Every structure is written in C-alpha cells, then in structure tokens.
Design an enzyme around this catalytic site. Structure first.
Site: not given
Ligand SMILES: CNCc1cc([N+](=O)[O-])ccc1Cl
Length: 330
Positions: A35, A199
């Site tokens: 992430d 962008s």
């Molecule tokens: C979709 N809500 C939980 C979740 C949040 C994130 N996020 O990056 O905020 C990623 C995966 C999940 Cl499973």
C-alpha cells in the site's frame, strides 16, 4: 541488494493485490497488500480477537526466535474507506522477494474492522508511503522500504500491476525489460506523507487531450481512479446510460457497454488506461448495472491514482534524497 516478488489479484475484478512476505524465524509467509498510500506494516496475528479472524493466515510471534516485543508501543490506523485496525508491535526479520530487513516493526493486530475480517485473502498491509505517516506510538517506526533503502543497489521500488493477471514489485533496481519506451519522471511532494504528484491532464477515448494540472497520490492500496468531478463527468458522458447513483455510491453504467479508454498525462508523456480496465462488474450478483472504475474524488479531499491507473503503467517510486515518480507504458 535487491528483491523481486510477484503480486497477484485477490479476485476476478482486481479489487486488490497480495504479495507474499516472509516474517520471523522460521519464516511465516503472509500475503500482504502493498500500500503506497500508508506507512504501517500490520498483520493478522495470534493476538487478533478470535471473532475477527475468518480464514486469514496469522503471524504468531511466540513461534519466531527473532521476534521481540517493542515494549510499550501501540498502533491504530483508520483508512480512507472507513476501515481500521490496531494493536501492539514486535520487531522481527521481514523478507520480500529475497530482500531481508532485520529489526522491522511488525504491527500485530489486536482488533480489525469488519471489512478486513470479511476479506479472507488479505493477511495484512505493507505500507510504502513515507514513514512520517507511520502510526506507532510513542516511537514512530520506519517502513520496510525505508529500512531497506541504504542496502539497495538503487533507492527505488517499482510497481508493475497486472490487469486480471499477476504482476511484480521490485526493490532496488529498474527492470528495463518490463516497460516500453522511456520512463518519464515527475516531481513528488512529501508534505502530506504520500507519493503526491501532479498529472498534466487527460483525454477520454480518442478525444483531444485537455491540459490541466491534477494533483493526486499514487496509491497501490486503492482499487479505483478518483479524480475531480469535472473530469469524471466528462468520462462517463461518453458512455450511453451511465449515471451517478447515490444509492450505489458512484457512477454505474450498463454492463452491455463498451467503455472508452482514459488517458492521463505525466509531463509530456501519456498513459492510456484501456476501457476494459474501468469495468468493475455488476453492482450486485446478476445485475445488469456495472460499477465504474473512474469515480469522483469530491469529498475525499484528494485525487487518487489507484490501481485502475497504476496497472496501465510501469511505475517507479524513486526514494532518493529528493523523491520522484516515474511512469512508463508497458
Ligand atoms: C476494503 N476495506 C478493508 C481494506 C482496506 C484496504 N486499504 O488499503 O485501505 C486494503 C484492503 C482492505 Cl481488505
């Protein structure tokens, strides 16, 4: 040093991507969501409230000879979609694709919100934004990338996400066979802790390119592309029957439609998102209304170049002293 790991969609829609990560000694392999929009490495664990675990693989620090409790440290995070998690902290050895960091903060979840529990395929998150966003208290902790950076051949990682297919995260090198043409680099602001860039504009389908500055963040942990309402309206106006639905929570379109492409600018270069990348399927099982992959950022407070955009490119996250972002077609 370098590392290279395959990242795999969790489902047929590319709702998220998971990458295997080795934690502890002997290794415990968990599938984490990498992430670039957050800065905590947190995992489902033997400490997670039992009723909140439903199929995830857990980290058990008591079974790792290299795990050590980070005494007094806690963490708590809330994400843009309203999900959250919190717990305590261990340090342990963490490896991604052959690249090893010792002493990495591994944030062990005691509590997770329902959308984490309900996603059995995601065992935690590995944050790759800037360490200034890390939530550990009272001593903020560094991301995996920041801890690895000094050892890497080059202070970079790259995201090469697939459309309905696996892709690759590389650390410490740029794979020149993984993209076409040249990489165009663009300035990053770290002031909000994100890979934030501007962008240079957009086009819808075969339409003319509109030169306009669009600030936003490169966020591998967000599924969709969130852009200003003006841009999003111009896109969906080219799809017969598309509309913004307050009951569904965004733009929907007839599943029978063929979607136009969407182009975004990176300096003088252009990244083309094929129309099929913008189709997120029926809003509910069996519906003929389909959910759009380009949505308004109005009310989020920031534009988000999530997976819909990033998977159309080979993306360089350059963590040199002055960070930059690179995009290439592929
Ligand atoms: C979709 N809500 C939980 C979740 C949040 C994130 N996020 O990056 O905020 C990623 C995966 C999940 Cl499973």
């Amino acid at each position: 040093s370098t590392g290279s790991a395959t990242t795999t969609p969790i489902d047929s829609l590319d709702d998220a991507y998971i990458t295997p990560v080795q934690i502890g000694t002997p290794a415990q392999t968990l599938n984490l969501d990498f992430d670039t929009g957050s800065s905590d490495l947190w995992v489902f664990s033997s400490e997670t409230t039992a009723s909140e675990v439903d199929g995830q693989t857990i980290y058990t620090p008591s079974k790792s000879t290299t795990a050590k409790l980070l005494s007094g440290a806690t963490w708590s995070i809330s994400y843009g979609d309203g999900s959250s998690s919190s717990g305590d902290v261990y340090t342990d050895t963490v490896s991604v694709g052959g690249l090893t960091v010792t002493g990495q903060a591994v944030e062990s979840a005691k509590k997770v919100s329902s959308s984490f529990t309900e996603d059995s395929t995601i065992d935690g998150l590995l944050g790759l934004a800037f360490s200034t966003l890390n939530t550990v208290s009272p001593t903020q902790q560094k991301t995996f990338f920041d801890n690895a950076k000094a050892s890497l051949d080059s202070p970079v990682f790259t995201a090469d996400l697939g459309y309905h297919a696996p892709g690759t995260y590389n650390f410490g090198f740029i794979d020149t066979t993984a993209y076409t043409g040249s990489i165009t680099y663009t300035a990053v602001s770290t002031k909000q802790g994100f890979w934030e860039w501007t962008s240079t504009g957009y086009a819808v389908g075969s339409g003319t390119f509109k030169s306009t500055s669009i600030d936003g963040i490169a966020d591998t942990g967000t599924t969709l592309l969130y852009l200003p309402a003006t841009v999003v309206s111009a896109y969906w106006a080219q799809v017969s029957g598309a509309k913004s639905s307050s009951s569904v929570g965004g733009y929907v379109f007839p599943c029978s439609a063929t979607l136009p492409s969407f182009t975004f600018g990176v300096g003088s270069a252009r990244i083309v998102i094929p129309g099929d990348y913008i189709d997120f399927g029926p809003i509910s099982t069996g519906s003929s209304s389909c959910f759009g992959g380009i949505q308004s950022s109005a009310g989020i407070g920031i534009n988000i170049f999530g997976d819909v955009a990033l998977k159309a490119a080979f993306v360089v996250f350059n963590g040199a002293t002055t960070p930059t972002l690179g995009f290439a077609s592929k």
